[PDB]
Amino acid sequence: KMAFPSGKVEGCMVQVTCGTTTLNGLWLDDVVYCPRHVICTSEDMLNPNYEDLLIRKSNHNFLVQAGNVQLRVIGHSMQNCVLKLKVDTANPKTPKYKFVRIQPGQTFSVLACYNGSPSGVYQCAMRPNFTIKGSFLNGSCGSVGFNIDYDCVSFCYMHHMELPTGVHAGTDLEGNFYGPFVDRQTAQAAGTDTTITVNVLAWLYAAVINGDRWFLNRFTTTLNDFNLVAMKYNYEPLTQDHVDILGPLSAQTGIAVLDMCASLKELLQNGMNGRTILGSALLEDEFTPFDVVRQC
Amino acid sequence: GFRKMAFPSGKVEGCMVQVTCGTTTLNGLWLDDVVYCPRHVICTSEDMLNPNYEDLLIRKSNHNFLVQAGNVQLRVIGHSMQNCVLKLKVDTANPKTPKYKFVRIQPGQTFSVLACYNGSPSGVYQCAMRPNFTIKGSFLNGSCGSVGFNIDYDCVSFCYMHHMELPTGVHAGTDLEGNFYGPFVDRQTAQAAGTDTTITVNVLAWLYAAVINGDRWFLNRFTTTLNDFNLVAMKYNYEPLTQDHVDILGPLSAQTGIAVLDMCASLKELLQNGMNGRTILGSALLEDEFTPFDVVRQC
Ligand SMILES: *[C@H](O)[C@H](C[C@@H]1CCNC1=O)NC(=O)[C@H](CC(C)C)NC(=O)OCc1ccccc1
Ligand SMILES: *[C@H](O)[C@H](C[C@@H]1CCNC1=O)NC(=O)[C@H](CC(C)C)NC(=O)OCc1ccccc1
């Protein structure tokens, strides 16, 4: 479980304060992105009218700081659930970057921040139910999740809230929530979660690459038959994109994706019969095919 | 929530460089006008098998050492060897040098590793110094010179530089003075470590974490003395718990209202009976690479 180095993102974190409400923002070029609920009072958060709340706001009500150095706001706008604050200085540490929306099952690093200061970095997976099992306390909103490909930071998550069950929910960098949630201090519940099949399969491939292959059988299956059985075990169905991203591991091992699926199916139907895989009786579902290839 | 969390690695990323000698390439740490790297970068194929490092080193010149920081070569103007690390004096100071210190950690302590290849950061993860002085890392060919570290305030405490992988797949290395953790040597020979044990005070800290996060099926009403717990612990190849350890757990005991020795009673029941298919914080094994401080910080 390995995070991306966080330095390129650390160089982009700032704090944003309205009155006494402070959270984190992301400073890229001359724009700071943050959760729109920074403009909320305690009682505004019960059920906020964000449009009305923002109409009462001016550039001069937003305190943006990098460290203790203030950054002057020269314009503001709301895009879905994120506030965009134009500032008078371009971040000299701006990396090459992209905003992306990730699929359930994908992993990303989270730079957990408080008051604009990074406290830690960890690797997360987006669950099928569009929550993440984060580690976030009060003041963490506006922390971001990201991948780094080559030199380019792909920003995929901004943190907004904790659900009753202790899991976390947020948006992409365009302010669109992952999943059915809304930024209201109201009662909300994640759907029942399911196992990320594509990742379990990646894990089995990883086990084969390391010589652990007792679970391979001489059978195969159709993708549709597999998907129908998997759902009976609370496993996600596979998509064509999943079959494709397993390509490199399939090529590396010589084991066809649908043969590995027949192997997983047999594991689901017969259990582990007491044996282990990569030193464990549980199947891991938070390593993507990309993650396996990275560490191998 | 709960997650294995690493320190942010920006301060260390700004110190990593590539070092090359012959056909050997690994990573170096550039602080002020010195680059630190594992000394076996001066070795060849033949050499690694049984190197006489002082002999190999006196036969080198400054210009046998190629240091690259990004696209930019740094010129080496001096070199010395301190135990198993080589110190390269360069004609340029690193402007990104953080406040730092060199520390030797104790077994059971945790630190973050910034894994690097050819002088470029690739990933960060949390490790602990095992009781047998190995670390269960993720290091591939080319990762030597990668460092482990803790951050307090704005200060980076470097505690580990990476040198090798043992046949079992665990890893070994040195502090930044070049002294190995454990009975290992920087020679290309198969080496075994002593028998490992589980870091008990960290297992307890992680059980407290599981209670803070509302996961508590393993608690019980039993109790135990410190010495009667340590007897069972040692039987199962767990480290003894000291009174200092009990004290260190105080804040976590206070937060949860579970006295340390009651948590020891829970752990004792888990050791003797096991988990019977159950899981704590999502694990089917007792985790021992979270310290009390790691739990407090994050919760
Ligand atoms: C923004 O920092 C904050 C992060 C929450 C707080 C504790 N852990 C988190 O992940 N977000 C909120 O407080 C959010 C605001 C709404 C307008 C969306 N409401 C929320 O998360 O309520 C749940 C909660 C649980 C425990 C403590 C505080 C809040
Ligand atoms: C330095 O980058 C390298 C790191 C090893 C290579 C594989 N994983 C690692 O962590 N260290 C060595 O190659 C070391 C050099 C001696 C002179 C100390 N030898 C070593 O670790 O041998 C084991 C090995 C296993 C798998 C591939 C290559 C080497």
XYZ file of C-alpha atoms and ligand atoms in Angstrom:
653
model
C 0.000 0.000 0.000
C 2.054 2.818 -1.408
C 1.140 6.461 -1.859
C 2.506 8.746 -4.547
C 5.078 11.241 -3.259
C 3.078 14.238 -2.102
C 5.528 17.101 -2.721
C 3.936 18.385 -5.915
C 0.574 18.584 -4.090
C 2.039 19.971 -0.874
C 3.199 22.933 -2.956
C -0.462 23.648 -3.834
C -2.213 23.548 -0.430
C -3.555 26.759 1.133
C -6.184 27.617 3.706
C -9.467 29.380 3.075
C -11.470 31.032 5.832
C -14.839 32.745 5.956
C -15.447 34.247 9.367
C -14.298 31.438 11.657
C -14.893 28.542 9.212
C -11.507 27.353 7.869
C -10.792 24.522 5.462
C -8.174 23.665 2.871
C -7.931 24.862 -0.711
C -5.910 23.927 -3.789
C -3.928 26.711 -5.473
C -3.182 26.066 -9.158
C -2.081 28.935 -11.385
C -4.163 31.946 -10.166
C -7.178 29.975 -8.924
C -7.892 28.469 -5.521
C -10.420 25.590 -5.425
C -12.192 24.644 -2.191
C -15.471 23.183 -0.879
C -18.284 25.712 -1.141
C -19.427 25.044 2.420
C -16.653 27.263 3.751
C -19.254 30.053 3.349
C -21.568 28.287 5.826
C -22.160 29.086 9.438
C -22.925 26.274 11.874
C -26.678 26.792 11.397
C -26.357 27.429 7.662
C -25.071 23.870 7.347
C -28.360 22.339 8.579
C -29.887 23.163 5.176
C -27.893 25.813 3.281
C -29.100 27.960 0.403
C -25.663 28.201 -1.189
C -26.853 30.563 -3.924
C -28.254 33.046 -1.416
C -25.257 32.553 0.862
C -22.793 33.426 -1.914
C -24.758 36.499 -3.072
C -24.067 38.044 0.301
C -20.320 37.400 -0.150
C -17.676 39.582 -1.767
C -14.048 39.017 -2.669
C -13.078 40.786 0.562
C -14.867 38.238 2.818
C -12.508 35.368 1.812
C -9.207 34.945 3.707
C -6.816 32.824 1.667
C -3.426 32.062 3.188
C -0.376 30.069 2.163
C 1.228 29.539 5.514
C 0.526 32.840 7.224
C 0.950 34.848 4.009
C -2.307 36.236 2.679
C -3.271 35.804 -0.957
C -5.558 38.496 -2.321
C -8.845 37.270 -3.846
C -9.914 39.170 -6.976
C -12.978 37.187 -8.016
C -15.136 34.304 -6.969
C -17.540 31.847 -8.494
C -19.327 28.619 -7.585
C -19.153 25.531 -9.785
C -21.391 22.820 -8.384
C -20.092 22.114 -4.882
C -16.705 23.863 -5.208
C -15.870 27.525 -4.851
C -13.328 28.951 -7.312
C -11.471 31.986 -5.978
C -9.397 33.974 -8.459
C -6.275 35.324 -6.768
C -3.748 37.952 -7.805
C -0.668 35.639 -7.771
C 0.062 32.553 -9.870
C 1.314 29.663 -7.746
C 4.990 29.354 -8.663
C 4.837 25.685 -7.546
C 1.951 24.819 -9.868
C 2.770 21.391 -11.359
C 1.626 20.046 -14.678
C -1.906 18.932 -13.816
C -5.281 17.590 -14.908
C -8.707 17.281 -13.330
C -10.137 13.771 -13.758
C -13.196 11.922 -12.527
C -12.326 8.408 -11.371
C -14.375 5.179 -11.526
C -15.275 3.112 -8.460
C -12.466 0.669 -7.835
C -9.717 3.130 -8.757
C -7.138 4.105 -6.172
C -5.531 7.474 -5.400
C -3.325 9.081 -2.759
C -4.861 11.480 -0.234
C -2.862 14.341 1.250
C -4.620 14.916 4.551
C -4.342 18.597 5.497
C -5.393 20.790 8.392
C -5.324 24.584 8.205
C -3.488 24.364 4.923
C -0.727 22.186 6.378
C -0.174 18.581 5.270
C -0.326 15.997 8.041
C -0.023 12.703 6.124
C -0.414 10.855 2.852
C -2.156 7.526 2.331
C -3.577 5.395 -0.440
C -7.370 5.127 -0.889
C -9.759 3.229 -3.120
C -13.082 4.601 -4.303
C -15.637 1.979 -3.200
C -18.440 0.802 -5.519
C -20.781 2.742 -3.236
C -18.788 5.972 -3.937
C -17.383 6.370 -0.440
C -13.760 6.135 0.624
C -12.426 4.672 3.866
C -10.475 7.776 4.693
C -8.893 9.025 7.883
C -10.232 12.590 8.152
C -10.954 14.797 11.171
C -12.561 18.227 11.546
C -10.717 20.747 9.405
C -9.752 18.237 6.686
C -12.257 19.421 4.079
C -10.540 20.523 0.908
C -7.853 17.830 1.184
C -7.398 16.300 -2.263
C -6.767 12.895 -3.746
C -4.544 12.489 -6.763
C -2.522 10.235 -9.026
C 0.831 11.151 -10.645
C 1.557 9.900 -14.175
C 5.022 10.877 -15.352
C 5.251 14.489 -14.177
C 1.548 15.286 -14.284
C -0.740 15.375 -11.251
C -4.263 14.126 -11.991
C -6.477 15.554 -9.255
C -9.475 13.317 -8.723
C -11.008 13.977 -5.270
C -11.735 16.843 -2.895
C -12.924 16.023 0.592
C -16.314 17.285 1.882
C -17.878 15.031 4.518
C -18.082 11.999 6.803
C -21.079 9.659 6.688
C -22.635 8.121 9.804
C -20.790 4.794 9.241
C -17.430 6.574 9.432
C -16.681 6.502 5.684
C -16.049 9.626 3.655
C -17.538 11.375 0.636
C -16.539 14.192 -1.681
C -16.376 15.590 -5.202
C -14.169 15.727 -8.253
C -12.403 19.032 -8.847
C -15.399 20.291 -10.838
C -17.531 20.043 -7.700
C -19.632 17.013 -8.715
C -20.070 14.578 -5.872
C -19.085 11.009 -6.285
C -22.251 9.071 -5.522
C -25.653 10.324 -4.374
C -24.516 12.660 -1.588
C -25.042 16.395 -1.028
C -23.105 18.963 1.037
C -25.778 19.350 3.729
C -25.345 18.504 7.400
C -28.225 16.016 7.002
C -28.690 12.272 7.477
C -27.264 10.341 4.521
C -26.390 6.697 4.057
C -24.087 4.938 1.645
C -25.492 2.092 -0.410
C -24.387 -1.382 0.644
C -20.798 -1.879 -0.462
C -19.491 -4.623 -2.777
C -16.110 -6.170 -3.550
C -14.037 -4.651 -6.353
C -13.693 -7.680 -8.627
C -11.187 -6.138 -11.053
C -8.821 -5.527 -8.151
C -9.199 -8.985 -6.635
C -8.288 -10.341 -10.055
C -5.225 -8.049 -10.153
C -4.252 -9.457 -6.732
C -4.563 -13.044 -7.987
C -2.306 -12.151 -10.913
C 0.178 -10.636 -8.441
C 0.084 -13.910 -6.524
C 0.854 -15.841 -9.730
C 3.754 -13.512 -10.584
C 5.241 -14.375 -7.165
C 4.860 -18.131 -7.607
C 1.634 -18.622 -5.602
C -0.685 -20.351 -8.075
C -2.501 -23.301 -6.448
C -5.876 -21.687 -7.308
C -5.424 -21.813 -11.088
C -7.789 -24.325 -12.736
C -8.106 -25.752 -16.253
C -11.524 -24.141 -16.893
C -12.791 -20.835 -18.305
C -16.052 -18.879 -18.342
C -17.927 -16.240 -20.265
C -17.875 -12.691 -18.938
C -21.628 -12.726 -18.634
C -21.764 -16.034 -16.738
C -19.048 -14.758 -14.440
C -20.829 -11.431 -13.857
C -24.062 -13.195 -12.985
C -22.352 -15.425 -10.406
C -20.188 -12.653 -8.983
C -23.203 -10.500 -8.104
C -24.546 -13.461 -6.078
C -21.435 -13.096 -3.872
C -21.694 -9.264 -3.591
C -18.812 -8.864 -6.072
C -19.038 -6.136 -8.702
C -19.673 -7.149 -12.317
C -16.752 -6.633 -14.697
C -16.837 -4.057 -17.465
C -15.073 -4.170 -20.802
C -12.691 -1.487 -19.463
C -11.860 -3.844 -16.557
C -11.077 -6.667 -18.961
C -8.795 -4.248 -20.847
C -6.915 -2.903 -17.794
C -6.147 -6.502 -16.793
C -4.418 -6.868 -20.170
C -0.836 -6.209 -19.092
C -1.064 -8.658 -16.150
C -2.687 -11.228 -18.446
C 0.177 -10.793 -20.918
C 2.823 -10.964 -18.191
C 1.464 -14.253 -16.838
C -0.001 -15.841 -19.962
C -3.280 -16.406 -18.055
C -6.336 -15.217 -19.936
C -8.591 -12.831 -18.068
C -11.568 -15.215 -18.379
C -9.480 -18.121 -17.102
C -8.517 -16.093 -14.042
C -12.254 -15.324 -13.658
C -13.041 -19.037 -13.697
C -10.428 -19.426 -10.962
C -11.969 -16.661 -8.843
C -15.431 -18.152 -9.413
C -14.231 -21.505 -8.041
C -12.780 -19.679 -5.033
C -16.122 -17.974 -4.438
C -18.052 -21.220 -4.762
C -15.735 -23.545 -2.799
C -14.027 -21.124 -0.435
C -10.314 -21.157 0.284
C -10.511 -24.696 1.744
C -8.260 -23.343 4.496
C -5.393 -22.267 2.229
C -3.876 -18.818 1.725
C -2.825 -16.585 -1.163
C 0.105 -14.174 -0.780
C 0.067 -15.002 2.912
C -3.575 -14.318 3.669
C -6.948 -16.023 3.836
C -8.733 -12.857 2.687
C -8.784 -11.623 -0.909
C -7.511 -8.054 -1.228
C -9.568 -5.601 -3.310
C -7.738 -2.243 -2.972
C -4.813 -2.977 -5.335
C -5.594 -1.994 -8.938
C -3.878 -3.539 -11.937
C -1.782 -0.342 -12.081
C -0.801 -0.673 -8.411
C 0.341 -4.296 -8.882
C 2.477 -3.338 -11.873
C 3.988 -0.391 -9.963
C 5.138 -2.505 -6.987
C 6.219 -5.419 -9.259
C -11.328 6.215 10.153
C -7.954 4.443 10.169
C -5.187 4.048 7.590
C -1.445 3.399 7.461
C -0.362 7.009 7.015
C 3.065 8.280 5.885
C 4.562 11.687 6.546
C 4.263 14.083 3.589
C 7.424 13.542 1.536
C 7.964 16.936 -0.150
C 10.824 17.981 2.128
C 12.710 14.764 1.250
C 11.833 14.755 -2.463
C 13.821 18.006 -2.772
C 16.945 16.223 -1.510
C 17.061 13.167 -3.769
C 19.679 12.917 -6.496
C 21.094 10.230 -8.737
C 24.622 8.917 -8.119
C 26.617 6.861 -10.589
C 30.003 5.188 -10.604
C 30.876 2.828 -13.433
C 27.819 0.813 -14.432
C 26.252 1.165 -10.951
C 23.518 3.709 -10.295
C 21.592 4.450 -7.117
C 20.075 7.314 -5.113
C 21.705 9.955 -2.955
C 20.525 12.386 -0.286
C 21.724 15.984 -0.975
C 21.819 18.057 2.210
C 23.658 21.422 2.038
C 26.867 20.695 0.041
C 27.074 16.925 0.775
C 25.500 13.939 -0.965
C 25.081 10.748 1.096
C 24.703 7.378 -0.569
C 25.420 3.694 0.025
C 29.122 2.943 -0.457
C 28.510 -0.175 -2.592
C 27.944 2.186 -5.523
C 31.737 1.997 -5.942
C 31.542 -1.771 -6.510
C 31.546 -3.813 -9.713
C 30.131 -7.262 -10.427
C 33.182 -9.063 -9.039
C 33.514 -6.597 -6.166
C 30.130 -6.964 -4.496
C 30.854 -10.621 -3.688
C 33.514 -9.710 -1.109
C 34.434 -6.003 -1.189
C 37.372 -4.424 0.620
C 35.815 -0.989 0.592
C 38.768 1.087 1.865
C 40.840 -0.513 -0.890
C 38.206 0.085 -3.591
C 37.696 3.675 -2.415
C 41.332 4.835 -2.370
C 41.486 3.825 -6.060
C 38.633 6.240 -6.932
C 38.824 9.887 -7.839
C 36.218 12.588 -7.544
C 35.561 12.401 -11.308
C 34.598 8.751 -11.045
C 31.400 9.980 -9.298
C 28.591 11.329 -11.490
C 25.856 13.111 -9.512
C 22.753 14.376 -11.320
C 20.054 16.615 -9.821
C 17.376 16.605 -12.487
C 18.992 17.599 -15.777
C 21.964 19.089 -13.932
C 25.261 17.425 -13.085
C 26.881 18.463 -9.799
C 30.680 18.365 -9.622
C 32.157 16.325 -6.779
C 35.026 18.140 -5.061
C 35.703 15.656 -2.259
C 34.689 12.232 -0.977
C 34.882 10.321 2.261
C 33.419 7.154 3.702
C 31.739 6.905 7.094
C 31.074 3.241 7.803
C 28.715 2.025 5.052
C 27.855 5.451 3.576
C 29.844 7.552 1.164
C 29.805 11.332 1.538
C 30.295 13.314 -1.664
C 31.237 16.951 -1.255
C 29.793 18.967 -4.116
C 30.385 22.510 -5.261
C 26.700 23.496 -4.939
C 24.527 23.693 -1.862
C 21.005 22.327 -2.045
C 18.654 25.313 -1.582
C 15.833 22.913 -0.695
C 17.669 21.510 2.349
C 15.166 21.256 5.206
C 15.831 21.568 8.874
C 17.081 18.066 9.576
C 18.796 15.664 11.921
C 20.188 12.145 11.791
C 18.786 9.742 14.349
C 19.087 6.031 14.989
C 15.646 4.585 15.686
C 14.847 1.680 18.011
C 13.094 -1.519 17.044
C 9.363 -0.975 17.140
C 9.528 2.633 15.969
C 7.968 3.531 12.636
C 9.130 5.850 9.878
C 8.152 6.763 6.345
C 10.129 5.519 3.343
C 10.458 7.549 0.144
C 11.230 4.914 -2.473
C 13.291 6.373 -5.350
C 14.779 5.112 -8.614
C 17.513 6.957 -10.542
C 17.181 9.869 -8.186
C 13.420 10.279 -8.760
C 10.750 9.699 -6.082
C 8.305 6.934 -6.932
C 6.253 6.227 -3.757
C 5.960 6.689 -0.028
C 4.813 4.231 2.622
C 5.084 3.579 6.361
C 7.466 0.924 7.794
C 8.556 -0.183 11.231
C 11.983 -1.285 12.390
C 11.343 -4.933 13.169
C 12.691 -6.384 16.428
C 15.188 -8.382 14.327
C 16.310 -5.141 12.658
C 14.846 -5.855 9.255
C 12.093 -3.806 7.628
C 9.305 -5.187 5.493
C 9.718 -2.788 2.598
C 8.884 -2.528 -1.070
C 12.235 -1.951 -2.744
C 13.305 -3.055 -6.226
C 16.579 -2.937 -8.098
C 17.858 0.635 -8.092
C 16.242 1.725 -4.801
C 19.414 1.827 -2.745
C 19.945 5.231 -1.243
C 16.213 5.606 -0.619
C 15.725 6.973 2.923
C 13.314 6.616 5.809
C 12.369 9.514 7.962
C 10.077 11.087 10.494
C 8.938 14.722 10.571
C 8.499 16.710 13.785
C 7.214 20.232 13.135
C 9.377 21.438 10.240
C 12.319 19.124 11.091
C 13.110 15.938 9.149
C 14.747 13.219 11.232
C 16.464 10.846 8.834
C 16.729 7.364 10.350
C 17.300 4.859 7.493
C 19.132 4.460 4.214
C 18.375 1.439 2.054
C 21.115 -1.074 1.062
C 19.780 -4.599 0.346
C 17.098 -7.313 0.216
C 17.520 -10.563 2.108
C 16.519 -13.906 0.557
C 13.280 -13.934 2.584
C 12.287 -10.692 0.820
C 12.648 -8.349 3.794
C 15.079 -5.443 3.698
C 18.171 -4.207 5.510
C 20.012 -0.909 5.690
C 21.781 1.646 7.839
C 21.288 4.819 9.778
C 22.711 7.939 8.138
C 26.003 7.406 9.966
C 26.359 4.264 7.877
C 25.909 1.704 10.662
C 23.661 -1.224 9.790
C 20.543 -1.980 11.706
C 21.045 -5.613 12.626
C 23.759 -8.173 12.016
C 24.021 -7.479 8.312
C 26.868 -6.558 5.973
C 26.922 -4.801 2.585
C 28.205 -7.804 0.655
C 26.331 -9.706 -2.061
C 25.867 -12.860 0.054
C 22.745 -14.603 1.261
C 22.060 -13.457 4.803
C 19.415 -14.552 7.260
C 18.044 -12.434 10.083
C 17.358 -13.475 13.630
C 13.899 -14.741 14.536
C 11.456 -11.884 14.421
C 8.881 -11.074 17.083
C 5.707 -8.983 17.113
C 5.864 -5.448 18.510
C 3.404 -5.815 21.420
C 3.005 -2.150 22.367
C 2.015 -1.428 18.733
C -0.527 -4.246 18.661
C -2.108 -2.765 21.776
C -2.077 0.721 20.224
C -3.817 -0.690 17.186
C -6.450 -2.443 19.324
C -7.163 0.961 20.918
C -7.455 2.450 17.440
C -10.023 -0.279 16.642
C -12.083 0.714 19.698
C -11.958 4.419 18.880
C -13.356 3.431 15.486
C -16.171 1.452 17.233
C -14.862 -2.082 16.560
C -14.779 -3.913 19.864
C -15.876 -7.574 19.675
C -12.445 -8.623 21.103
C -12.815 -6.817 24.443
C -13.436 -8.835 27.592
C -13.975 -8.457 31.316
C -10.839 -10.404 32.296
C -7.758 -8.785 33.740
C -4.098 -9.628 34.098
C -0.927 -8.490 35.751
C 1.847 -6.994 33.695
C 4.104 -9.985 34.405
C 1.470 -12.630 33.710
C 0.783 -10.934 30.378
C 4.489 -10.823 29.501
C 4.782 -14.571 30.207
C 2.099 -15.373 27.630
C 3.448 -12.775 25.210
C 6.903 -14.290 25.156
C 5.425 -17.757 24.730
C 3.874 -16.529 21.469
C 7.000 -14.669 20.308
C 5.716 -11.212 21.222
C 7.977 -8.574 22.736
C 7.651 -7.940 26.459
C 5.661 -4.913 27.523
C 7.550 -2.513 29.782
C 6.121 -0.015 32.231
C 7.290 2.746 29.891
C 5.112 1.089 27.231
C 2.153 1.056 29.630
C 2.674 4.767 30.313
C 2.937 5.579 26.605
C -0.474 3.976 26.154
C -2.037 6.218 28.802
C -3.620 8.818 26.512
C -5.207 6.016 24.512
C -6.373 4.345 27.720
C -7.791 7.669 28.916
C -9.514 8.428 25.627
C -11.272 5.055 25.578
C -11.596 4.409 29.305
C -9.950 1.000 28.860
C -7.051 0.439 31.226
C -3.877 -0.852 29.606
C -3.885 -4.140 31.517
C -7.494 -4.783 30.501
C -6.461 -4.363 26.865
C -3.626 -6.784 27.625
C -6.273 -9.241 28.821
C -8.038 -8.877 25.458
C -4.820 -9.419 23.522
C -3.992 -12.468 25.651
C -7.360 -14.050 24.718
C -6.665 -13.360 21.031
C -3.229 -14.959 21.267
C -4.508 -18.159 22.864
C -7.763 -18.561 20.859
C -7.179 -16.553 17.679
C -9.657 -14.508 15.700
C -11.911 -17.367 14.435
C -12.634 -15.775 11.047
C -13.287 -12.350 12.602
C -11.345 -9.189 11.702
C -10.174 -6.009 13.432
C -10.069 -2.756 11.443
C -10.397 -5.016 8.396
C -7.389 -7.233 9.144
C -7.327 -10.978 9.799
C -3.974 -10.615 11.588
C -2.894 -8.429 14.486
C -1.118 -5.366 13.044
C 2.065 -4.222 14.787
C 3.382 -1.301 12.671
C 1.335 1.492 14.337
C 2.939 3.072 17.397
C 0.937 4.748 20.155
C 2.016 8.098 18.739
C 0.947 7.083 15.234
C -2.506 6.239 16.594
C -2.823 9.430 18.642
C -1.611 11.692 15.830
C -4.152 10.272 13.391
C -7.171 10.077 15.778
C -14.910 19.512 6.670
O -13.673 19.515 7.284
C -15.724 18.400 7.452
C -14.926 16.950 7.460
C -15.627 15.862 8.322
C -15.554 16.249 9.808
C -15.045 15.036 10.578
N -14.616 14.079 9.550
C -14.920 14.505 8.266
O -14.638 13.844 7.286
N -16.972 18.286 6.839
C -18.170 18.429 7.507
O -18.135 18.660 8.715
C -19.556 18.277 6.761
C -20.088 19.670 6.325
C -21.333 19.636 5.451
C -21.858 21.029 5.048
C -21.153 18.780 4.181
N -20.495 17.578 7.655
C -20.142 16.309 8.173
O -19.161 15.721 7.761
O -20.955 15.744 9.152
C -20.535 14.467 9.753
C -19.590 14.622 10.971
C -19.139 13.533 11.756
C -18.277 13.698 12.856
C -17.818 14.950 13.219
C -18.239 16.035 12.450
C -19.108 15.869 11.362
C 20.518 -1.413 -4.272
O 19.604 -0.776 -5.141
C 20.053 -2.861 -4.140
C 18.521 -2.977 -3.677
C 17.993 -4.438 -3.664
C 17.843 -5.032 -5.074
C 16.466 -5.778 -5.087
N 15.744 -5.210 -3.980
C 16.529 -4.462 -3.146
O 16.088 -3.920 -2.175
N 20.927 -3.571 -3.218
C 21.621 -4.696 -3.603
O 21.488 -5.141 -4.736
C 22.542 -5.447 -2.651
C 23.967 -4.955 -2.875
C 24.979 -5.522 -1.907
C 26.465 -5.203 -2.327
C 24.730 -4.992 -0.503
N 22.373 -6.902 -2.932
C 21.156 -7.527 -2.678
O 20.294 -6.952 -2.054
O 20.957 -8.805 -3.168
C 19.623 -9.305 -3.193
C 18.830 -9.102 -4.535
C 17.525 -9.644 -4.726
C 16.811 -9.467 -5.919
C 17.361 -8.745 -6.980
C 18.647 -8.210 -6.818
C 19.359 -8.387 -5.625
